[PDB]
From a paper:
Utilizing the published genome sequence of the organism, we hypothesized that the genes 0612, 0638, and 0637 encode for a 4,6-dehydratase, an aminotransferase, and an N-acetyltransferase, respectively, which would be required for the biosynthesis of one of the diacetamido-sugars, 2,4-diacetamido-2,4,6-trideoxy-d-glucose, starting from UDP-N-acetylglucosamine. In this report we present functional and structural data that demonstrate the proteins encoded by the 0638 and 0637 genes do indeed correspond to an aminotransferase (hereafter referred to as Pcryo_0638) and an N-acetyltransferase (Pcryo_0637). In summary, we have demonstrated that the genes in P. cryohalolentis, namely 0638 and 0637, encode for a PLP-dependent aminotransferase and an N-acetyltransferase, respectively. The data presented herein confirm the hypothesized functions of these enzymes and provide new insight into an unusual sugar biosynthetic pathway in Gram-negative bacteria.
The second model of Pcryo_0637 to be determined was that of a ternary complex with UDP-2,4-diacetamido-2,4,6-trideoxy-d-glucose (the product) and CoA. The model was refined to an R-factor of 16.4% at 1.55 Å resolution. The electron density corresponding to the bound ligands is unambiguous. The uracil ring is anchored into the active site by the backbone amide and the carboxylate side chain of Asp 41 and two ordered water molecules. The side chains of Asp 40 and Ser 11, along with a water molecule, lie within 3.2 Å of the ribose hydroxyl groups. Note that the side chain of Ser 11 adopts two conformations, the second of which allows it to form a hydrogen bond with an α-phosphoryl oxygen of the UDP-sugar product. Additionally, the phosphoryl oxygens are surrounded by numerous water molecules and the backbone amide groups of Cys 13 and Ala 75. The pyranosyl group of the UDP-sugar product directly interacts only with the side chain of His 142 and the backbone amide group of Gly 179 (both from a neighboring subunit of the trimer). On the basis of previously determined structures of related N-acetyltransferases, His 142 most likely functions as the active site base.
Numbering used by the authors:
A (entry chain AAA), B (entry chain AAA), C (entry chain AAA): 2 to 217
Write the structure that this text describes.
Amino acid sequence: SKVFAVYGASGCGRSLMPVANEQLRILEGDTDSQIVFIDDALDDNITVNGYTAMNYTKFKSIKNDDKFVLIAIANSSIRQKIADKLVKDGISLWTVQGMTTLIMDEVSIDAGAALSPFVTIAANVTIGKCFHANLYSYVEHDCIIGDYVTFAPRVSCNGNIHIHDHAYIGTGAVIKQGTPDKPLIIGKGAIVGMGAVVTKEVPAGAVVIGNPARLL
Amino acid sequence: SKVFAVYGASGCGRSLMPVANEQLRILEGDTDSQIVFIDDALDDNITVNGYTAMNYTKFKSIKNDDKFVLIAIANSSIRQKIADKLVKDGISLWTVQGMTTLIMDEVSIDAGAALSPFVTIAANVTIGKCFHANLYSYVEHDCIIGDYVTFAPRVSCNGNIHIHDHAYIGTGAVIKQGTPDKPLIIGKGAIVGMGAVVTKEVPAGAVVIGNPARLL
Amino acid sequence: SKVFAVYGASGCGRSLMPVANEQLRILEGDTDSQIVFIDDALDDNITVNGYTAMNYTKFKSIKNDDKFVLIAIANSSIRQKIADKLVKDGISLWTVQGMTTLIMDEVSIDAGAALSPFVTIAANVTIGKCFHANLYSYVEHDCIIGDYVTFAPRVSCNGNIHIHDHAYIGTGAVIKQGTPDKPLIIGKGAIVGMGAVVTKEVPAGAVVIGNPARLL
Ligand SMILES: CC(C)(COP(=O)(O)OP(=O)(O)OC[C@H]1O[C@@H](n2cnc3c(N)ncnc32)[C@H](O)[C@@H]1OP(=O)(O)O)[C@@H](O)C(=O)NCCC(=O)NCCS
Ligand SMILES: CC(C)(COP(=O)(O)OP(=O)(O)OC[C@H]1O[C@@H](n2cnc3c(N)ncnc32)[C@H](O)[C@@H]1OP(=O)(O)O)[C@@H](O)C(=O)NCCC(=O)NCCS
Ligand SMILES: CC(C)(COP(=O)(O)OP(=O)(O)OC[C@H]1O[C@@H](n2cnc3c(N)ncnc32)[C@H](O)[C@@H]1OP(=O)(O)O)[C@@H](O)C(=O)NCCC(=O)NCCS
Ligand SMILES: CC(=O)N[C@H]1[C@@H](OP(=O)(O)OP(=O)(O)OC[C@H]2O[C@@H](n3ccc(=O)[nH]c3=O)[C@H](O)[C@@H]2O)O[C@H](C)[C@@H](NC(C)=O)[C@@H]1O
Ligand SMILES: CC(=O)N[C@H]1[C@@H](OP(=O)(O)OP(=O)(O)OC[C@H]2O[C@@H](n3ccc(=O)[nH]c3=O)[C@H](O)[C@@H]2O)O[C@H](C)[C@@H](NC(C)=O)[C@@H]1O
Ligand SMILES: CC(=O)N[C@H]1[C@@H](OP(=O)(O)OP(=O)(O)OC[C@H]2O[C@@H](n3ccc(=O)[nH]c3=O)[C@H](O)[C@@H]2O)O[C@H](C)[C@@H](NC(C)=O)[C@@H]1O
Ligand SMILES: [Cl-]
């Protein structure tokens, strides 16, 4: 027996719960396990879109040895804080993908990814912990994505790109491919703005916007 | 017995007829009902891509009590004019979606929407009359879309956006999310240009272009 | 009996091989035929992502009368050179599409197209030799695409556009629709940069960038 949850019942979680249901009901063939929202804004349990929603105290208190959680909070500092809490409390991080999520050959993705509908993860890609790939995003050949990286919808991450930990790539951003000899690097905790067209390495902690991308 | 039609046999209609066939043949499981084009440019009936095409006089003259029409004309002033005519003549507005159109939880869409392939309508979205969501467009969590709103392909409408009646959002436009406290508003009859990156409220009747979006 | 191949085992080929397998195993229902990589960088045979990879000398030497090749090299000058070699050596050019590739009515596509997942080819489109439509690209109503045209991912080619031979359209580029009276032309060997917003005819051999698109 198992219990599943989506951690976060705001916009991120409510748009991932259908995806978590595709993962659980169809890709895992599991019509038996219950799935709930966790949200620490809650004191008393409520329902959100027809699902039981409870705080983490209540979720921990459930008498089941086999808990699986997708963290659906886009802020990667919160996501890492919650991931470390879950693992310390013996709760499993749970990767979710949609029926229309395309995974190609020799792809490695750490536990707890949120892979939205219409996402492509292409050939020979490596992805670290609790990756968020929102609707329509792709990661193309030979990319290395670090830990707690967050893509908005419709991110175009071309080939031979290395994205370091905690980077955020905004809606519809386009990133030029690197080369095998010189991967294009997005530095740790960098922010690429919505619609930015990234043609060069982005420094760690930089915010870049526009076409072409410039420091903000 | 029923008769279906796509109103408009130009580019909008010819790229929606396959979608209307997915809706009718697969999602409604209906292999019996006939589907035709209506186009008032026609005097004599013709065929368009292997479908009978006739003007509205001829379509009205069909002896069937149960008519269903998708309006495939992108100009929203024409679309509203035709919708009001159809309803007055006792003809039903017909929502069409593709096999790859994704509708999430607690979504409300008024009759007569054209929801193209690869469209996502995410959690807790409300949409008014004869919405056009062209290929790859999405409407994310908590949005409220008014009447006769038109999206070109690949519109990125993020969460907590309110789009008023008759707005037009151009190809690949990106709209910044609002907040629960302050939805980002696109005003009545506003035009957001292709590739525009919208980061603030757009006034009613405004035309905005570029990255970032500015008045034209 | 037949032998299939993907010509090019770098990023283009490795992200197309899964698509070639969807085409062969599912759309052609063929679990019998072998599929390999050809790559002329190879001296001795190797494996690439669990597929045999050999140079063209070795591929020619295979004793089979019925060879089918998808050219997965994005550089269209190389692609044409290889296509002419294959045809001269009595090897068939092979069109591949994904399970999520959408082809609409009255579409004509010459042999040897690479049609990626989530690609739409809309109504009444005509496409010439060895077309590349990378992930998420679309070609909308009434377009005419010439020979050895290459789309990066997420190209938005709207209606009534004529793209001449050997043009390259970069990641996330948007092209304004033409009219029936005046198709918007992308000239021979033109390059449209990533994220370019094309609102007018592009001259043959021009490089255009930005929003709006300008000569570089
Ligand atoms: C880039 C970004 C992080 C900057 O955030 P911020 O510092 O709060 O910026 P503000 O909204 O205060 O705007 C700063 C200025 O830059 C502009 N700007 C903001 N985002 C921009 C963008 N992506 N491209 C270009 N200009 C942008 C604003 O219009 C403003 O101009 P002004 O000073 O003349 O008024 C933010 O706008 C962004 O792009 N975030 C991603 C949104 C997104 O992807 N949503 C998807 C959710 S699923
Ligand atoms: C924004 C828009 C409505 C303006 O239309 P318009 O007033 O007829 O504009 P024009 O085509 O005459 O061009 C006006 C100027 O702005 C530029 N321009 C036009 N559209 C632009 C856009 N989206 N972004 C930036 N610049 C744009 C033109 O290049 C031109 O520059 P110029 O005066 O230096 O020559 C139109 O270009 C547009 O974006 N429409 C949407 C197209 C689309 O989404 N098609 C999908 C069909 S399914
Ligand atoms: C437009 C393009 C062909 C130009 O290539 P290039 O001539 O080698 O250009 P460079 O990378 O040397 O950069 C030239 C300058 O223009 C800028 N630039 C490059 N591409 C740009 C683009 N698409 N939009 C805007 N500016 C761009 C660069 O930042 C640079 O600015 P700088 O001189 O101030 O440093 C190329 O950048 C491009 O867009 N290619 C498509 C990439 C792609 O689609 N990849 C998908 C692979 S599947
Ligand atoms: C306001 C805003 O920009 N929200 C965007 C954000 O959604 P969330 O990541 O759900 O961010 P929220 O701040 O809206 O919500 C986080 C939720 O997480 C909960 N939370 C947070 C911390 C914690 O320790 N426990 C916990 O339960 C918290 O109570 C809240 O309900 O990320 C999505 C990917 C965005 N999506 C789109 C399409 O625009 C949302 O608009
Ligand atoms: C020229 C142009 O920009 N056409 C774009 C428009 O297609 P339509 O909405 O089909 O616009 P049209 O003007 O081309 O056609 C409208 C059709 O509607 C018919 N019509 C119009 C009025 C009416 O009362 N009756 C009626 O039958 C009219 O005869 C005509 O055949 O909207 C699509 C969504 C665009 N798509 C793309 C991908 O570019 C088309 O290019
Ligand atoms: C470095 C680079 O920009 N590669 C991009 C290119 O991938 P390819 O078209 O695979 O280009 P390559 O130069 O990387 O490889 C071509 C292959 O083709 C082979 N080749 C070339 C010539 C020939 O005669 N025989 C032959 O076998 C050659 O040995 C090589 O392995 O085109 C894709 C569509 C891009 N995709 C993305 C998503 O970024 C790749 O990053
Ligand atoms: Cl897309």
